[PDB]
Amino acid sequence: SGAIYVGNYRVVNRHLATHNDWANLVWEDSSRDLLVSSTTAQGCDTIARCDCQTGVYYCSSRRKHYPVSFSKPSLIFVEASEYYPARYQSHLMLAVGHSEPGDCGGILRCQHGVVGIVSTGGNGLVGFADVRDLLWLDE
Ligand SMILES: NC(=O)[C@H]1CCCN(C(=O)Nc2cccc3c2SCCC3)C1
Ligand SMILES: [Zn+2]
């Protein structure tokens, strides 16, 4: 679990969105596993606007942060799960690192701010949904 809180927005994994997220929906994209909802409070985070390929992410299944080298946002095949049919997920970045199903929502950050959130994983890999191209989150 986890979310990004920026301005009057809450960014979460679309497959983990609550009834309240859907009732206050701003934007969602099943191909990116992202959903953004509106909030009444201002929130704590800032978004990176950069091309970093190294950063640090929070891994809830180890209660620890780990440094990672990650690929550029791209279209990657993701096997069927209880949440989605087999499909290509877009704007996804892979890295070698530990992750388990409940780790989705963990934040990836570089020196410039929040880069994205944990969205996929398995066998010593961890996939992050990029948020750096969503320029409207800052206004
Ligand atoms: N973005 C998606 O389509 C996700 C939706 C939730 C289920 N999917 C996962 O990749 N879950 C997951 C996360 C982290 C680690 C492991 C897993 S499943 C296998 C064991 C490792 C696909
Ligand atoms: Zn950066």
Curated annotation (Swiss-Prot):
Signal peptide: none
Catalyzed reactions: Selective cleavage of Tyr-|-Gly bond in the picornavirus polyprotein
Residues of the active site: 15 (for protease 2a activity), 33 (for protease 2a activity), 104 (for protease 2a activity)
Residue numbers binding Zn(2+) 1: 50, 52, 110, 112
Top-level taxon in the UniProt lineage: Viruses
Subunit structure: Homodimer.
Name of the molecule in the record: Protease 2A
Covered range of the whole protein: 869 to 1007 of 2193
